[PDB]
Ligand binder design. Structure first.
Ligand code: NAG
Ligand code: NAG
Ligand code: AT3
Ligand code: AT3
Ligand code: CL
Ligand code: CL
Ligand code: CL
Ligand code: CL
Ligand code: CL
Ligand code: CL
Ligand code: CL
Ligand code: CL
Ligand code: CL
Ligand code: CL
Ligand code: CL
Length: 532
């Protein structure tokens, strides 16, 4: 039986699914860890105890407990990111799409979802790996991990809530793939992990963490990097937020043991209800429970690891979208709304800058303001809006990524950088939002190949082009087809710093992505805030 696979953890039975007038095998809901429930909440994951009998892997598993976006009820633009399955703390499962007939030893790609470490599901329609598994002949795996306080509550020193357990969930899933993917026809020595935003940051964190390095061959980071102002906190800040969470739930705060005991007795939704009250500043693009620089998963500060080359040396493919910050301004910045063009007044622009750079003093804010303001026309609502959009994307995604790429390439074995600037023709979000954060994903997963989804013929060509770059990179460490007549995606080098745009137009090569603004964010502003 092509749908029956015997693994080291036990037997599993998948289901046959249709895809682009053909079919492939799908094994959904495979458990890789013991349910992290009860006294196991906030604790490191435990491997799933082997089972006798056949595990039914015909349907999607539950999604981890998380905040649910209800800012636009019934709107597909936002609900397509929400959990589409019931939520439960019993959520540590992985899904696998296997070509048919089953391969013997083919390239494997493991997807790590984003969601600011506070949300995300492996079951979203936009993450369906059948199109990619079928089109590129790869074994596509999508894992899951605890988010919110459930996966990142951090009380360093404690052994009940050490922090980073969400990252350990990811690692345990990677370990499972390492040990069992061969049974599904995948090559465990040719595993590429890829993810977007928080998932991209996660990928970078596995590149850094010694305990994850041996579990994969190469990586792809989309709109995310480990060094991002929002992807991690110090052990002290992690502790402060954990304590504050307890304070919000009337917990005994006399000891970690007591705090944890109290937090474990609360219902999931109780923690989620007050999750956002623990942020230290009024801000956007900042999440409460994220990875912590603890000295375990991360030996030293991320910057010192990057400077000394203390990370896995392999090939990486990464990039960003043109308008990473628009989503976050819509949800929290004054003056922005979904049904208007969101032309911003000078006043709202000022408020936006403050929300975007919470760690900056007045001089720092003046610096950012000066850098992104057209003083010949500073009341221009469109320029104010776009300027704010750039500030958010540059500070939170692009410049941190450019810093990572510059540091990684010094020791790496091959870097490929892209700039995705094509807005989907069928995007339901307003036009002012541009090439939105996360909207390159549908292209990576081949949704444009599905007629009923209504993408242009050109967009279908882009998706196929992108999927082939990704899969070819996963397979060989180079996105370019050897001896092909296609345009070549040049390697990114310290010297030339080349990258390509990813859109429906003929591929063009550029250099020094966002270098002017990133020198400001990566070199100048930090010096300024330090000197003042
Ligand atoms: C990658 O490493 C191999 C040796 O393992 C070397 O031959 C090759 O030139 C390297 N490629 C780059 C661009 O670093
Ligand atoms: C999984 O397979 C079983 C066969 O044992 C089938 O009866 C069941 O419908 C499947 N799971 C679902 C959809 O509940
Ligand atoms: C800005 C948006 O449309 S939300 C996307 C959520 N994701 C980055 C984790 C996929
Ligand atoms: C992009 C987002 O959903 S953050 C908004 C959540 N908040 C209302 C609790 C701050
Ligand atoms: Cl076995
Ligand atoms: Cl289909
Ligand atoms: Cl830890
Ligand atoms: Cl930080
Ligand atoms: Cl405490
Ligand atoms: Cl609940
Ligand atoms: Cl607080
Ligand atoms: Cl900041
Ligand atoms: Cl000034
Ligand atoms: Cl830099
Ligand atoms: Cl859409």
């Amino acid at each position: 039986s092509e749908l029956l696979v015997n693994t080291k953890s036990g037997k599993v039975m998948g289901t046959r699914v249709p895809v682009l007038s053909s079919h492939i095998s799908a094994f959904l809901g495979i458990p890789f860890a013991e349910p992290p429930v009860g006294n196991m909440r906030f604790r490191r994951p435990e491997p799933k105890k082997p089972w006798s009998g056949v595990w039914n892997a015909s349907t999607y598993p539950n999604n981890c407990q998380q905040y649910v976006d209800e800012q636009f009820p019934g709107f597909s633009g936002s609900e397509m990111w929400n959990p589409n399955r019931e939520m439960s703390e019993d959520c540590l499962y992985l899904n696998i799409w296997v070509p048919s007939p089953r391969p013997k030893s083919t390239t494997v790609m493991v997807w790590i979802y984003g969601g600011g470490f506070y949300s995300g599901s492996s079951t979203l329609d936009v993450y369906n790996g059948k199109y990619l598994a079928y089109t590129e002949e790869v074994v596509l795996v999508s894992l899951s991990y605890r988010v919110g306080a459930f996966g990142f509550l951090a009380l360093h020193g404690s052994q009940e809530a050490p922090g980073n357990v969400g990252l350990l969930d990811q690692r345990m899933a990677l370990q499972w793939v390492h040990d069992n993917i061969q049974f599904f026809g995948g090559d465990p020595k040719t595993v590429t992990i890829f993810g977007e935003s928080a998932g991209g940051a996660s990928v970078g964190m596995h590149i850094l963490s010694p305990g994850s390095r041996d579990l994969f061959r190469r990586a792809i980071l989309q709109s995310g990097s480990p060094n991002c102002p929002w992807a991690s906190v110090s052990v002290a800040e992690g502790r402060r937020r954990a304590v504050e969470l307890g304070r919000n739930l009337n917990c005994n705060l006399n000891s970690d043991e007591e705090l944890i005991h109290c937090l474990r007795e609360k219902k999931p939704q109780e923690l989620i209800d007050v999750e956002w009250n623990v942020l230290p500043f009024d801000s956007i693009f900042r999440f409460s429970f994220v990875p912590v620089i603890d000295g375990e998963f991360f030996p030293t500060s991320l910057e010192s690891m990057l400077n000394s080359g203390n990370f896995k040396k392999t090939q990486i493919l990464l990039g960003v979208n043109k308008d990473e910050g628009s989503f976050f301004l819509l949800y929290g910045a004054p003056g922005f709304s979904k049904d208007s063009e969101s032309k911003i007044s000078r006043e709202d622009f000022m408020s936006g800058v403050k929300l975007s750079v919470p760690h900056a003093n007045d001089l720092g804010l003046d610096a950012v303001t000066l850098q992104y303001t057209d003083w010949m026309d500073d009341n221009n609502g469109i320029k104010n809006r776009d300027g704010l959009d750039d500030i958010v994307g540059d500070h939170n995604v692009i410049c941190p990524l450019m810093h990572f790429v510059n540091k990684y390439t010094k020791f790496g074995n091959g870097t490929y950088l892209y700039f995705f600037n094509h807005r989907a023709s069928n995007l339901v979000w307003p036009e002012w939002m541009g090439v939105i954060h996360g909207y390159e994903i549908e292209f990576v997963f081949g949704l444009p190949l599905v007629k009923e989804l209504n993408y242009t013929a050109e967009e279908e060509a882009l998706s196929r082009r992108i999927m082939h770059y990704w899969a070819t990179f996963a397979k060989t460490g180079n996105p370019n087809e050897p001896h092909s007549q296609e345009s070549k995606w040049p390697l990114f080098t310290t010297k030339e710093q080349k990258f390509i745009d990813l859109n429906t137009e003929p591929m063009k090569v550029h250099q020094r992505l966002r270098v002017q603004m990133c020198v400001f964010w990566n070199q100048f502003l930090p010096k300024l805030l330090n000197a003042t």
